[PDB]
A = this chain, B = another copy of it.
Amino acid sequence: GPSFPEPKVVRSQGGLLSLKLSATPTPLAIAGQRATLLTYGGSFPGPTLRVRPRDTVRLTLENRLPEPTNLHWHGLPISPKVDDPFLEIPPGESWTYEFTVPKELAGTFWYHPHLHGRVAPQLFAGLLGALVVESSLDAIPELREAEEHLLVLKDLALQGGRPAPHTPMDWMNGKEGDLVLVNGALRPTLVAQKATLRLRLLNASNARYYRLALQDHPLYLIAADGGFLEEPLEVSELLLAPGERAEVLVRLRKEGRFLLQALPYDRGAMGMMDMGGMAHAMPQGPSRPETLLYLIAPKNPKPLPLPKALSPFPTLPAPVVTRRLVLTEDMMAARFFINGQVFDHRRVDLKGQAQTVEVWEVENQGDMDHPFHLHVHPFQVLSVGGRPFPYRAWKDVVNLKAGEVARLLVPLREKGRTVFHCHIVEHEDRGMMGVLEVG
């Protein structure tokens, strides 16, 4: 096969992407070993769905797992009557998701389970895939002529040829695995054929962070979770928290081998120690550095010029309400809270009005990083930790370190009941989720 493994792509045909996908235990070869994972479409990751604005998507999910499941169309500003976080597909049953891709949309999105209390083990076991919305902006020469790849960043741990079970500490921290993979492959080699690469990045891990850095190179950020920036932004490194996506341009500067690494990052995960009358929580500290892939540059690379502009960010109406949502932790209980409460699917927490804009101030009063996700309604990050964001773009997950406040501008789009929650999915399963009703 191609030196660089990427998931199989399924494309819309004549404006329709009609596909049946089964969620199923699947024996497969992974990182040189045989394992049974839970997959969509018999692969890990699941197939990449590639569509254009205004396409119709008709996806029938057949549940062949021994427990109920469903889909979250992560990042898609569609109706919560379609992207329904409360729906349950029982074992053996099927459900058809049908929606139209919004006209003003572009970027890398993804799909995975969202059945409360069962997300972490299902996602950890392999149930996820990417969805790419192609844009007319892809036709500009500076992007068209780049070599494009999707990088699904997901780790895994195996025990007896199956995904390792969650421990109590896993429910507290979020589970990370020792196999740190790209597109389900262990440290693949990308042999570049062009000097400019356009990489779509997805963190589909339960809890692992990727502090991304390419040896000897900067990255040029061109898209965030849910759309393009206004112009490329040069960065020395790029942190991708669970659930986040980014698109970058890489401009290969000379021939050679360059490592794309996940540099040490301390997200505040905790261990336990006993030092002669202790038995108390201790920080795990920063992650060990990981090599994600080997990047081989072509001979005499001459990268393209960067595009001067991408997409202008919409001018939003003035906001009509300000909300405050405080995150707290009970680590030893592995319970997690928003405004002092745990999720209750019967309780509406916030009531907003469609087509108005709100300001959400999300404050992390815990000690762990928490990546805050809102369904259905993409937002503009204004500032985090009192620092203004250096670009305008649509996001749907925002990482908060301990103590930090994020100020978000949230246009309310589709009507209905939806949710917001931490995307360390163990924390969501353990209660860190709330309900927004838009009318």
- Measured between beta carbons, the chain B residues less than 8 angstroms from A322 are 320-321
- Measured between beta carbons, the chain B residues less than 8 angstroms from A320 are 321-322
A287 to B59, CA, bound (A): 70
Q: Which residue of B lies closest to A359 (CB)?
A: B320
Q: Which residue of B lies closest to A321 (CB)?
A: B321
Give the interface size class of chain A. under 10
Q: Which residue of B lies closest to A320 (CB)?
A: B322
A321 to B319, CA, bound (A): 8
Question: Chain A, 295-322, contact with B by CB distance < 8 Å: what is the 0/1 string?
Answer: 0000000000000000000000000111
Q: Which residue of B lies closest to A318 (CB)?
A: B322
Which A311-337 residues have C-beta < 8 A from chain B? Answer: 320-322
A320 to B321, CA, bound (A): 5
Q: Which residue of B lies closest to A322 (CB)?
A: B320
Q: How far is the CB of A348 from chain B (nearest CB, A)?
A: 12
Which A33-57 residues have C-beta < 8 A from chain B? Answer: none
A322 to B322, CA, bound (A): 9
Q: How far is the CB of A218 from chain B (nearest CB, A)?
A: 39
Q: How far is the CB of A321 from chain B (nearest CB, A)?
A: 5
Q: How far is the CB of A268 from chain B (nearest CB, A)?
A: 30
Which A142-159 residues have C-beta < 8 A from chain B? Answer: none
A320 to B320, CA, bound (A): 8
Q: How far is the CB of A154 from chain B (nearest CB, A)?
A: 40
Question: Chain A, 332-362, contact with B by CB distance < 8 Å: what is the 0/1 string?
Answer: 0000000000000000000000000000000
- Measured between beta carbons, the chain B residues less than 8 angstroms from A321 are 320-322
A179 to B321, CA, bound (A): 48
A76 to B321, CA, bound (A): 27
A322 to B321, CA, bound (A): 6
A320 to B359, CA, bound (A): 9
A320 to B322, CA, bound (A): 5
A320 to B360, CA, bound (A): 11
Question: Chain A, 392-406, contact with B by CB distance < 8 Å: what is the 0/1 string?
Answer: 000000000000000
A322 to B358, CA, bound (A): 10
A-side residues, CB < 8 A to B, are 320-322
Contact sample, A vs B, 4 pairs, CB 8 Å cutoff: A320-B321, A320-B322, A321-B321, A321-B322
Q: Which 4 A-B pairs have the closest CB atoms?
A: A320-B322, A321-B321, A320-B321, A321-B322
